[PDB]
Amino acid sequence: TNEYVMTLDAGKYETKLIGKNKKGTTEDIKRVIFKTKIYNLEDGYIDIEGNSHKIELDGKEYLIGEQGVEDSSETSKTNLIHKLAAYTAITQVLDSNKNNKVQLVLACPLSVLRNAKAKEEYRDYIKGNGEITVKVDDKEYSFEITDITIKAEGSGVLFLEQENFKNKNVAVIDFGGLNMGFSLYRNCVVNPSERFIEEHGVKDLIIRVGDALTDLNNGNLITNEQAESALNNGYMKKGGEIDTESSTVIKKVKEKFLKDAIKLIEKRGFKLDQLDSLIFIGGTTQKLKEQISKTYPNNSIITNNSQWTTCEGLYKVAVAKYC
Amino acid sequence: TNEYVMTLDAGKYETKLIGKNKKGTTEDIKRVIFKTKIYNLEDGYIDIEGNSHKIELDGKEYLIGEQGVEDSSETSKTNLIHKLAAYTAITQVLDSNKNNKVQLVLACPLSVLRNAKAKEEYRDYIKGNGEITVKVDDKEYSFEITDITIKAEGSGVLFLEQENFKNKNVAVIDFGGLNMGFSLYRNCVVNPSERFIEEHGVKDLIIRVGDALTDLNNGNLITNEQAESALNNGYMKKGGEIDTESSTVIKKVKEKFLKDAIKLIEKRGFKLDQLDSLIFIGGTTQKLKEQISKTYPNNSIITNNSQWTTCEGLYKVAVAKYC
Amino acid sequence: TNEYVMTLDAGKYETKLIGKNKKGTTEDIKRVIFKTKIYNLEDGYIDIEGNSHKIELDGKEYLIGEQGVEDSSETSKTNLIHKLAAYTAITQVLDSNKNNKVQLVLACPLSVLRNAKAKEEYRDYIKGNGEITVKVDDKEYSFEITDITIKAEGSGVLFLEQENFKNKNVAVIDFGGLNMGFSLYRNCVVNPSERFIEEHGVKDLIIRVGDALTDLNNGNLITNEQAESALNNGYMKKGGEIDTESSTVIKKVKEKFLKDAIKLIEKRGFKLDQLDSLIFIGGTTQKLKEQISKTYPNNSIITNNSQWTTCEGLYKVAVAKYC
Amino acid sequence: TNEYVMTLDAGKYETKLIGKNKKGTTEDIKRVIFKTKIYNLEDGYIDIEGNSHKIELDGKEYLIGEQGVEDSSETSKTNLIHKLAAYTAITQVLDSNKNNKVQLVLACPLSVLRNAKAKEEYRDYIKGNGEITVKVDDKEYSFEITDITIKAEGSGVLFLEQENFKNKNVAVIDFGGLNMGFSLYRNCVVNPSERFIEEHGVKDLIIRVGDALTDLNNGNLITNEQAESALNNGYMKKGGEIDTESSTVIKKVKEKFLKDAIKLIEKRGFKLDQLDSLIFIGGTTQKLKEQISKTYPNNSIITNNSQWTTCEGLYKVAVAKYC
Amino acid sequence: QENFKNKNVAVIDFGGLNMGFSLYRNCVVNPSERFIEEHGVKDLIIRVGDALTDLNNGNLITNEQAESALNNGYMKKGGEIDTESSTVIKKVKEKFLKDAIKLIEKRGFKLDQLDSLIFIGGTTQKLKEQISKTYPNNSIITNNSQWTTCEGLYKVAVAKYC
């Protein structure tokens, strides 16, 4: 048979997707990573070219990949929102040939991975054939799904990393936008008693640094020169030896963030020596990985393009499903 | 089908209109922008050629586009005034072919966008077929409306600008004749708590500069040479190095106006860094855009022909409605 | 006839009500002021005595006045929520005699005061007879409404104050929890061009002072002694001459808040001398009235129990309606 | 009607139950609290009197309430185990009269409270009539269920406490045997981003103190006099001023446990001042409540008989369901 | 702020008319690994404007602010119907970046043997973002690139002053 593996990650505010066919043609990651937003092309507006595509689902020309450079309907949502997003994500990066037979590997929140949702209703959404168009003047693809494989999101990350693992203790430290989530596994099974969430994220980090409700994003006020009123854009790039603004602040905020994270680890997880590895993932990983590595030697690990960690993990299980 | 998109903006003292058919033939903006005044051609007066047209509505030959070069009835009004203006605005720039099928995109004050008005009665005015003539000796057009789309006026401006937007914070700073209005949006939704009006406009600006109740318009007294007793006509064009009249005054008045506007922003809106963009629109935009850009870097943005900002925004939603 | 006047104010998070019958018996203000929350007494829970009453509406024993000392259904809401709240507010403080004939005076947001809502649908809710019980083992009241009178919320405040007014310029400066709203009136008519909102409130104030996301409420951490980690509870009450925490902070935050408010006034409203009076209302009034009075002499005015300002204003129009 | 309220809590290793009928007759708590174990009386063994009862379900005489003083089948389990436990828990403390009509209030893990389980299958188990016997030579009860009400376990605790609550931020700090779980609520809704688990419990506490794998339970070696080789039985009761064993150890272990818990709170939850109350529950509450109260003033609260906290919370919703 | 005595660094200067790459190894310029490309920002905005005139952020004054960009204004047309760049910008810049990095790998060598590539010139602010995504942990930019040289010269002049 001619079957492909599609790996999808319907996360926070972005959807990540990867196929060997798309990866083979496009260099980006790429695959693809697009904001979890969807629009529709109505006559009450003027369509525009992407990075955005038009898809045929139901009646309606759905729009996905653009940010709203091509429509104003992106802000609008339906009940149906997620179901449309799934169809458009499957559509994108799906070119055989006309008939595209696949296996789908994806993940869902650990708390739902067994219930009626993200276990029966999610599988039902994924588990069916469908005809999807690509271009308004093209390109029809007939998609058949030969199998589906869903695991806990944190498992995609663990799988992507090259660690052995059958009888080890590992944790996934995910620095998200709004939260920092720690999921611990022992002998390939999640340990709920040793997992936890801290209700502070990168947004809180940059906020606490900016020392202002606004004014944080790498440009908080546009009427300030590039670099002024950072934070997310730009590090310690003020070559004025007289300035006293962070760098100093950054190391201060991050110092407390790291001390809180590791302190919780030792309370819940246990002796940092009993842990085989702690995978550092999330949007904030690149920001904190360095300091953590100096906090504790030979425990923390990071993967390149942390954003595609889950998908690369899911892809491996989907290859097994394909066999 | 053969359907067109008409975009209308029934604003302060001017009505702006745009159609692809009219834009294709006339170079002006143009489209059209005409004062929100209407007249009628009665036998008690002598009709004259425009830039003004005659329209057949009810019984009565309505007159629109002229300024009163062709009639004295322009000053006169009816209760009915606005309803006639709508019909004449639809009539203008409406040539298929005889049968003109359209979709109408327009806006209304944010405060009415959901009520019984500018949501039910306005839609009812727009939502119908009608036969309109163009010339007294011509030109009949049969107009059918296939749909209507109304949004908050500030939304037309946001849409016209090329910004992404689904999860950003933007404000529209509209320097009107009598008021300066700030409308803030977060994740494509207006935030009333972060919007406000200042009861001073361009008229107040030029007034405060002229330092006289009269005497302001670019010619306040006709018996003064062109440039004397400005303000609206002419900038710092007095090449007499001895003169001490503004330029100095202009920068002084504008200095206080900008300081007041930005001060209110920081009080209500928040840290200027938390704002992704502030679109500068209104008759006064061209006057203040320069100084604002120097006040704060990388935040303020302006579009060319600010007068057609709303209409170009509405046109995009109407293309979507047309689909 | 035996008719009474009921004055109601369905505001932000609290509902204020006043009747001459209730005021005559209870000393509180009192009248009443209760959070805009409603519950229901279901068999899946154990009812408890108030300050809370049970009301019969539809089928269901609605609950109002308690904070959730008597039920857990307070958090729950219906679509229907507001309509039930209206019935319970009318019920409370409504004792003739069995047959209670009234006139209802209330207000609504200025932006809706003329539309299909807060002008037709709100009047329809208020404008009807109804049988309401008071106690589960009592007390039936038959309520007839002989008239209804709705005005803009800011008008209730203006009316309550003792100022003359027919040909004057007045503004209402309302320091709310989340926003600070300024409504200007000239010759008894609201002037939209000279009214505005600042998207910062008392919550922002106390926040900015506390210098922490939590930790603000007069007790941010319960494990701190009364007075530590204020702010809302307690002023400058640290008699330790060594401490450097606010008072200093308070005057600093408030200094900027007042400078921003007055600066916006002078920009939008105009010369502070052209204003006859500025009524200072809202939860924050008591906090800022002192400093404002020193900012500008002979302009600012405050009324006692600012929370009942609107209702005392509405009551006066309802007496006129009663006649 | 003659309906009663049964409140059940099928927790960790114990099942708690409360009825007004049982509470009225027995003084214990009591209600009842029995280990989540079940046995059966087979001819291959000799039955014995309790604190244990015999119940008729299926065919089989189930046994519940004893610890295994009356049988050796307690260790044995079925697939069916939980379903039998539910029937025996309903049976116990269920005496009208012969016909017992009730409403059942219970809770389930927050992570399942909406799924196919602890939302549909659990409700199905609870939601039916059944005939249960009490004694082998008696006592038949016909049980009808008129309604069922399930909430998140942490909600039972919040409800039991006397706090208001509709617009507050509260957390439940549950010191369990194996884990310490923190559930945060804001405006009566759980906030997952601000909830977390630490994989250490009381067992870890006493373990870390005992400084031995065995040897901990209040008697680790029976051949040691009462008090020697504590910990769970007995505090600082060694009146030998020469001894250097804990008390010193206790305060040391608990010092680190409290520092870790509060440190995680400030990281995830936020400023301890933004929290209205933190309810301290679980088997460990009595152990740590004192030190926490000194750690932070005016925030921590405890209820008497923490073991019945959930049930007393569920009972209140069941009274509402009964109405 | 880089150390430098025994490293390989290049300066990628996006000028108005040219884009100049100067490579240093152990604090000495390597002529064999330096080069110029005869296209600048003017060529960039030109190629985007798709017109000889008409480019500067206002090419025709009789067009409303934003129309007939480019240098003034980015993707600020909030009309979802418009099909003019943003799309063009990413297209032109896509080719410009591919050409620059391709020349680097030909002349300079393996991008991994480079310790840092400082991105300077009027165009730096325009391309720094895309380059950073092209290759991780190599490109660096300084604030106010226009004063980069002077702040560098000032440091040697302090040494001369001593």
| Residue E133 CB neighbours (<10 A) | 11
CA distance D311 to chain C (A): 12
D165, D274, D317 member nearest C215 (Cβ): D274
Could you tell me where the DSSP H helices lie in D176-247? 202-210
Touching partners of C (3+ C-beta pairs < 8 Å): B, D
How far B310 CA sits from the closest chain E CA (Å)?
A: 10
> Which chains does B contact via 3+ CB–CB distances below 8 A?
A, C, E
Phi and psi for A263 in degrees, rounded to 5? -65, -40
Q: Which of B286, B304, B315 sits opposite E81 (nearest CB)?
A: B315
Torsion of CA C206, C208, C211, C217, to 10 degrees: 20
CB atoms within 10 A of CB D305: 14
Which residue of A117, A199, A268 is in closest CB contact with D270? A199
Nearest C-alpha neighbor of C71 from the set C101, C40, C102: C40
Tokens at B66, concatenated: 């002229």
d(CA D50, CA D68): 9
Give residue A152's region: left, alpha or beta (phi > 0; psi -120 to 50): beta
Q: Are C170 and C185 in contact (CB under 8 A)?
A: yes
Put simply, the answer to whether A214 touches B271 (Cβ < 8 Å) is yes
Q: Is B297 within 8 Å of A72 when comparing Cβ atoms? A: no
How do E28-29 and E19-25 pair as beta strands?
antiparallel
Two tokens at B28?
């002006």
Element (H, E) at D123: helix D121-126
The answer to whether A and D touch (≥3 CB pairs < 8 Å) is yes
Contact (Cβ atoms closer than 8 angstroms) between residue C296 and residue C261: no
CA dist., res. C184 & res. C168, Å (int): 10
Contacts of B169 in chain A (CB under 8 A): 214
- Between CA C98 and CA C142 the distance in angstroms is 6
The dihedral region occupied by A270, where left means phi > 0, alpha psi between -120 and 50, and beta the remainder, is left
CB B151 within 8 A of CB E68: no
Contact E79 A238 (CB under 8 A): no
Q: Is the peptide bond before A258 cis (omega within 30 degrees of 0)?
A: no
Structure tokens at B53: 């047209």
Amino acid in position B193: S
- Indicate yes or no: CB of A268 within 8 angstroms of CB of D197: yes
How far is the alpha carbon of B178 from chain C, nearest alpha carbon, in Å?
A: 7
Nearest to D199 by CA among B194, E156, A182: A182
DSSP state of B6: E
Q: Round to whole Å and give the CA distance between D31 and A237.
A: 67
Question: Which residue from D162, D297, D317 is facing C69, i.e. has the nearest CB?
Answer: D162
What are the start-end ranges of the E strands in chain C?
3-10, 14-19, 32-35, 39-40, 43-44, 53-56, 61-64, 99-108, 130-132, 141-152, 169-175, 180-186, 189-190, 196-198, 277-281, 300-301
3-class SS of residue B81 = helix
CA gap A40, B138 in Å, rounded? 41
Task: Give resolution in angstroms.
Answer: 19.7
Cα torsion E141, E143, E149, E154: sign? negative
- Reading the block at residue B246, the tokens are 């503004």
Contact at CB, E78 and B165, closer than 8 angstroms: yes
Q: Say if residue E6 is exposed, middle or buried (CB neighbours under 10 Å; 0-12, 13-18, 19+).
A: exposed
Nearest by CB to D271, which of C13, C215, C222?
C215
Give the residue among D105, D130, D117 at the shortest CA–CA distance from D9.
Answer: D105
| C-alpha distance from residue D297 to each of D6, D157, D171, D275 (Å) | 36, 21, 15, 12
Give the N- to C-terminal CA distance of chain C in Å, as an integer. 10
Q: How do E8-14 and E19-25 pair as beta strands? A: antiparallel
Helices A309-322 and A153-160: angle between axes, nearest 10 degrees? 90
Q: Is C95 helix (H, G, I), strand (E, B) or coil?
A: coil
Is E80's CB within 8 Å of A48's CB? yes
Task: Report the distance separating Cα C37 and Cα C41, nearest Å.
Answer: 14
Look-up: residue for tokens 């929520």? C81
Locate C320 and state its tokens.
């006129």
- Calculate how close chain C gets to D259, using CA atoms only, in Å: 13
Residue D315 to residue D311: CA distance in whole angstroms: 6
Cα separation of A292 and A180, whole Å?
14
* Element of type H or E holding D107: strand D99-108
Q: Which amino acid is located at A51 in the chain? A: N
Per-residue tokens: D231: 């910990």
* Beta-ladder partners of B117: none
CA distance D146 to E151: 82
* Alpha-carbon dihedral A176, A181, A185, A191, rounded to 10 degrees: -150
Q: Report how this structure was experimentally obtained.
A: cryo-EM
Nearest to A90 by CA among A138, A14, A141: A141
Residues in CB range of A35: below 8 A, 6 or more apart: A13, A14, A15, A67, B166, B167
Write down the residue that tokens 């559930």 correspond to.
D183
Closest Cβ–Cβ partner in C43, C67, C73 for D147: C43
CB pairs under 8 A between B and E: 73
Tokens 């010193």: give the residue. D248
Helix (H, G, I), strand (E, B) or coil at D159: helix
Phi, psi at A301, each rounded to 5°: -140, 145
Q: Which residue has tokens 């339906």?
A: A78
Q: How many CB atoms lie within 10 A of CB B127?
A: 12
Q: How many residues does chain B have?
A: 323
Q: What is the dihedral of CA D166, D171, D175, D178, to 10 degrees?
A: 100
> Measured in Å, how far apart are chain A's first and last C-alpha atoms?
10
* Token pair for E79: 């009309």
**Residue C195 and residue B191: Cβ atoms within 8 Å?**
no
Q: Which residue of B has its CA nearest to C177?
A: B193
Straight-line distance from the first to the last Cα atom of chain E, in angstroms, rounded to the nearest whole number:
21
User: Which ranges constitute the DSSP H helices of chain B?
Assistant: 20-25, 81-91, 121-126, 153-160, 202-210, 248-268, 285-295, 309-322
Q: Which residues contact A34 (CB under 8 A, 6 or more apart)?
A: A14, A15, A64, A65
Detail the DSSP E strand segments found in chain A: 3-10, 14-19, 32-35, 39-40, 43-44, 53-56, 61-64, 99-108, 130-132, 141-152, 169-175, 180-186, 189-190, 196-198, 277-281, 300-301
Distance between CA atoms of residues D183 and D195, nearest Å: 5
Residues B184-189: contacts with CB under 8 Å, at least 24 apart: B184/B269, B184/C199, B185/B154, B185/B155, B185/B158, B187/A75, B188/A74, B188/A75, B189/A75
Which has the closest alpha carbon to C198: B25, A228, B260? B260
Q: Are A145 and A130 in contact (CB under 8 A)?
A: no
